[PDB]
Write an enzyme that holds these catalytic residues in place. Structure first.
Site, PDB file in Angstrom:
ATOM      1  N   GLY A 146      65.044  80.845  44.925  1.00  0.00           N
ATOM      2  CA  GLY A 146      66.041  81.048  43.900  1.00  0.00           C
ATOM      3  C   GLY A 146      66.128  82.258  43.251  1.00  0.00           C
TER       4      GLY A 146
ATOM      5  CG  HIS B 250      65.936  87.425  51.740  1.00  0.00           C
ATOM      6  ND1 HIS B 250      65.265  88.225  51.356  1.00  0.00           N
ATOM      7  CD2 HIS B 250      66.348  86.264  51.101  1.00  0.00           C
ATOM      8  CE1 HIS B 250      65.176  87.717  50.016  1.00  0.00           C
ATOM      9  NE2 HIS B 250      65.728  86.307  50.138  1.00  0.00           N
TER      10      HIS B 250
ATOM     11  CB  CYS C  10      65.650  86.310  46.454  1.00  0.00           C
ATOM     12  SG  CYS C  10      63.885  85.715  47.015  1.00  0.00           S
TER      13      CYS C  10
HETATM   14  C1  LIG Z   1      59.905  81.133  47.405  1.00  0.00           C
HETATM   15  C2  LIG Z   1      59.757  82.443  46.365  1.00  0.00           C
HETATM   16  C3  LIG Z   1      58.794  82.539  45.150  1.00  0.00           C
HETATM   17  C4  LIG Z   1      58.635  84.106  44.609  1.00  0.00           C
HETATM   18  N1  LIG Z   1      59.404  84.962  44.926  1.00  0.00           N
HETATM   19  C5  LIG Z   1      60.220  84.766  45.961  1.00  0.00           C
HETATM   20  C6  LIG Z   1      60.423  83.609  46.830  1.00  0.00           C
HETATM   21  N2  LIG Z   1      61.276  83.519  47.760  1.00  0.00           N
HETATM   22  C7  LIG Z   1      61.148  84.248  48.932  1.00  0.00           C
HETATM   23  O1  LIG Z   1      60.141  84.758  49.354  1.00  0.00           O
HETATM   24  C8  LIG Z   1      62.151  83.998  50.031  1.00  0.00           C
HETATM   25  C9  LIG Z   1      61.726  84.746  51.413  1.00  0.00           C
HETATM   26  C10 LIG Z   1      61.146  83.709  52.233  1.00  0.00           C
HETATM   27  C11 LIG Z   1      60.767  84.227  53.510  1.00  0.00           C
HETATM   28  C12 LIG Z   1      61.071  85.421  53.958  1.00  0.00           C
HETATM   29  C13 LIG Z   1      61.693  86.379  52.960  1.00  0.00           C
HETATM   30  C14 LIG Z   1      61.994  87.865  53.451  1.00  0.00           C
HETATM   31  F1  LIG Z   1      61.975  88.720  52.503  1.00  0.00           F
HETATM   32  F2  LIG Z   1      63.341  87.734  53.996  1.00  0.00           F
HETATM   33  F3  LIG Z   1      61.284  88.059  54.221  1.00  0.00           F
HETATM   34  C15 LIG Z   1      62.067  85.975  51.734  1.00  0.00           C
END
Ligand SMILES: Cc1ccncc1NC(=O)Cc1cccc(C(F)(F)F)c1
Ligand SMILES: Cc1ccncc1NC(=O)Cc1cccc(C(F)(F)F)c1
Lengths: 304, 304
Positions: B143, B41, B145
């Protein structure tokens, strides 16, 4: 989102762990620069422990009696000295992995990471708090003496704790990196009991702010209180009296959530008087007091 | 004595963490040998996330579009490929700090350490468990990920998890190091809910043995039960059905304490039916299920 009892990454501390043997006793040492720090009880026998005369015992020891090993290579001891309850073994080689470091004496209520070690090798890392009675509720076995507690500010490792003993009550006692024990404890196998253990009120309030930041808001109520009223309740439940200094440290958390400190105190008051009623806060069924307001801000903002 | 939610020392994993930027998106990468692993992603924009065509998006990307940085030095990308939900960025330099490693797919109920990272830098380490519904209850922010989950067997780091997303329920979803998501999750910003989360019965029983080993024995009773009777109670309380395989893994803990597995099950049965009555076990007011029988043996024996 999500909230965990997070320890600091331990890499900078792993590169400092050595094994120190003296006679038939083997414990851990901390190699920083050309000096190895370890508990002075390394020079004792199982008979000496009842009431050791460390001055007399150290006098029967030479530099060649202290076997220091980093990984699988031997270090050459060129000096030895006793500073309070630690031995300082001067070695001829500086630790190539020495990080930027400080020796700090933490306050009760403050938290730190412990890197538990056996035979100079790391087994695990956990987040701990210095109890108000100056003990730590850690996880240590025979051979863990010499394991250090620390905090990390960007690249600087502040060493605050060195593990020395387990009390008959299963709780742990140790020193700062200058050999001074936290609390009234002595490095002698004698009757030792810690004071009353109170709950670190400011930390519980900080964790209540961490809960609200993460969606667990059920415990929020329509009430407020005063410092004096809250403190009458805190004493009844053996909680640390909350001061204006504590309120001020909770300022950033109060500003972030928009919930006034005394408003959060009123929630805490109701939680103490009525209990959790079978519910949980941040996956816990009790009030957590091992996250300072700094830990909450750090974890909720991702400070590396 | 003492029992903590202990993570593995993170040093061997810190030396693998890099920062990977692509367009305006920055996340973490895992540098092992001449390959950098990160969530795919990284190539998406905030508009692409609703339903990304990763094949089409990757096609508009070249090796020079992926900015990989270890510490403060730039790595030269000479190859890129998509494997399931991860990108594999081939760099011209092997990581001089690459440990002995394996890519393993863990089972639900098994535990692991997470090294949470931001901009390729480590912020903290905590012990986690793969929930039976294949989610993890971690602590992650924007951040994070690319942060990996791992286990350590002496010198070998077995990588099992890579963090990808947070679900609207605040729980976390990710993949193994081959890019296959644990559970039914897809890397798309869409409606995704995990299955029912059950309690890992064998882990709760392992933690009951850890409690007895540490002196907390109040919950021990004069009763026994059968696998079928216990399982009727386990289902009523959304606990994982206990099998003979689970009983066998609890063999070493049963042998150490002298308490038969079905005898411990009867204690658990009474704890589920009657609650803790205001008491605690290992400083907790609820039944802990994030320590496997291996974790208990490891912590209670000091395996480095
Ligand atoms: C903000 C945060 C907090 C904790 N762990 C992770 C995050 N970040 C996310 O989730 C990033 C994200 C956003 C929308 C879609 C995706 C996807 F996997 F591509 F589908 C990933
Ligand atoms: C067995 C263990 C478990 C956890 N933490 C620590 C330990 N080990 C000890 O306490 C070692 C010890 C034994 C008797 C006396 C002392 C002394 F400090 F010198 F007084 C020290």
């Amino acid at each position: 989102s999500g909230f965990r009892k997070m320890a600091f990454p331990s890499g900078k501390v792993e590169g400092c762990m050595v094994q120190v043997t003296c006679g038939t006793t083997t414990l851990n040492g901390l190699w920083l620069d050309d000096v190895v720090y370890c508990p002075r009880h390394v020079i004792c026998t199982s008979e000496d422990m009842l009431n050791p005369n460390y001055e007399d015992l150290l006098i029967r020891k030479s530099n060649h009696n202290f076997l220091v090993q980093a990984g699988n290579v031997q270090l050459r001891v060129i000096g030895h000295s006793m500073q309070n309850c630690v031995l300082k073994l001067k070695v001829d080689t500086a630790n190539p992995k020495t990080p930027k470091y400080k020796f700090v004496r933490i306050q009760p209520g403050q938290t730190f990471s412990v890197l538990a070690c056996y035979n100079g090798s790391p087994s695990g890392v956990y987040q701990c708090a210095m109890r108000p009675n100056f003990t730590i509720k850690g996880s240590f076995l025979n051979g863990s003496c010499g394991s250090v507690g620390f905090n990390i500010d960007y690249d600087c490792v502040s060493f605050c704790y060195m593990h020395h003993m387990e009390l008959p009550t299963g709780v742990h006692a140790g020193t700062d990196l200058e050999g001074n024990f936290y609390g009234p404890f002595v490095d002698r196998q004698t009757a030792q009991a810690a004071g009353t253990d109170t709950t670190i009120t400011v930390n519980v309030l900080a964790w209540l702010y961490a809960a609200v930041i993460n969606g667990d808001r059920w415990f929020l109520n329509r009430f407020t209180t005063t410092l004096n009223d809250f403190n009458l309740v805190a004493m009844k439940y053996n909680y640390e009296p909350l001061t204006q200094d504590h309120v001020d440290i909770l300022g950033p958390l109060s500003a972030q959530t928009g919930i006034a400190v005394l408003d959060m105190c009123a929630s805490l008051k109701e939680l103490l008087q009525n209990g959790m009623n079978g519910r949980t806060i941040l996956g816990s069924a009790l009030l957590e007091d091992e996250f300072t307001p700094f830990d909450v801000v750090r974890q909720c903002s991702g400070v590396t």
